[PDB]
């Protein structure tokens, strides 16, 4: 779900999000999304909101009080206005009972506002529930047509599968860097690997249950992960009363990864080798 194209589509009269901040939509993954598109007058844009009342809210489109999602509205004068009148847009003006949240009504039965039955034929005290939205280019900003899309994000017991794009960044190697691969976070050096992964397998583990090989998602390559060098620092020194000179031994560390001498114990700095 790329919300970036939604943001940059066009200037929007309203981009109001209930229950979720607009910035966190990309980084949050929802189970399902529902896009509800319709066209209403500019005055009725505010009626598409939880806890609101009106003709559109009661009889056309109702949102729950605990609705999680966003409502986006934008002007569509060039598309939904004609000099003769665009009568192709209709709204429900009369209904027996208020619409439940996320409910639609397509019945065209004549509204019965009187004791006498309407008998299915329009007449006195009987009115058509559906009225035409006579949009015109010269109408005031309150009455100009507006396209409204409501995004409803729902989470269920099923695993979530809808969210924003995953950044690729770049690939670096031969350096102790912080790596994040498909939620596997750590630090290491991603050198070349002679191992051959099976297409299904993404990770690789040592005998002692630790990750040692990984597969790159962007390009199907195998990288050997080696932890960054670490060791113990030991200080070689005579008595302080004798002198104040010291030498430092990095245990088990190659001398090129830190009066320098290389020994089997580690790298020695500050001491001179003699025969």
């Amino acid at each position: 779900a790329d919300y970036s194209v939604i943001y940059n589509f066009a200037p929007f009269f309203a981009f109001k999000c209930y229950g979720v901040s607009p910035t966190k939509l990309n980084d949050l993954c929802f189970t399902n999304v529902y896009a509800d598109s319709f066209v209403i007058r500019g005055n009725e844009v505010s009626q598409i909101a939880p806890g609101q009342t009106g003709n559109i809210a009661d009889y056309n489109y109702k949102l729950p009080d605990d609705f999680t999602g966003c409502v986006i509205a934008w002007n569509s004068n060039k598309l939904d206005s004609k000099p003769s009148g665009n009568y192709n847009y209709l709204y429900r003006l009369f209904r027996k009972s208020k619409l439940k949240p996320f409910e639609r009504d397509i019945s065209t039965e004549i509204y019965q506002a009187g004791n006498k039955p309407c008998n299915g034929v329009a007449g006195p005290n009987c009115y058509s529930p559906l009225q035409s939205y006579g949009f015109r280019p010269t109408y005031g900003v309150g009455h100009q047509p507006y396209r409204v899309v409501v995004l409803s994000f729902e989470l269920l017991h099923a695993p979530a599968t809808v969210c924003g794009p995953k950044k690729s960044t770049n690939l670096v190697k031969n350096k102790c860097v912080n790596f994040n691969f498909n939620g596997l976070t750590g630090t290491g050096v991603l050198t070349e690997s002679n191992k051959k992964f099976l297409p299904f397998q993404q990770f690789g583990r040592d005998i002692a249950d630790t990750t040692d090989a990984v597969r790159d998602p962007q390009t199907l390559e195998i990288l050997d992960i080696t932890p960054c060098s670490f060791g113990g620092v030991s200080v070689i020194t005579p008595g302080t009363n004798t002198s104040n000179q010291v030498a430092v031994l990095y245990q088990g560390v190659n001398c090129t990864e830190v009066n320098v001498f290389q020994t089997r114990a580690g790298c020695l700095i500050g001491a001179e080798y003699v025969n």
Partner: nanobody
């Protein structure tokens, strides 16, 4: 994509008869309701009559006898029978397919009467 075929219009003298026909090909999902609208010359658009999928008819003008709606379940088409034609019904007609999700519209038929 839905195509609503409109046919059966033209010039008819006063008191004549004709048969408008709308055939809905394309999506036209199962719980459909079919209707007819009227567009007088330079005026508003009112609803001629609507027929549902359970044969229930709702005429939106005191016009019973004038329009009669016939349903073809095998092809999911709707025919409007016009009789006793009088000059005040001279208007173009579009048929309205609500479907279930996205409603559609016709192309147009010229219905004219004068003497």
């Amino acid at each position: 994509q839905v195509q609503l075929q409109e046919s059966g219009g033209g010039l008819v003298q006063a008191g004549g008869s004709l048969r408008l026909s709308c055939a809905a090909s394309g999506s036209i999902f199962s719980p459909n309701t079919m209707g007819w609208f009227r567009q007088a010359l330079g005026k508003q658009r009112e609803g001629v009559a609507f027929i549902s999928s359970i044969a229930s008819t709702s005429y939106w003008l005191p016009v019973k006898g004038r329009f009669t709606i016939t349903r073809d379940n095998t092809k999911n088409t709707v025919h409007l029978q016009m009789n006793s034609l009088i000059p005040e019904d001279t208007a173009v007609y579009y048929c309205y397919a609500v479907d279930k999700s996205q409603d559609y519209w016709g192309q147009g038929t010229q219905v004219t009467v004068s003497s």
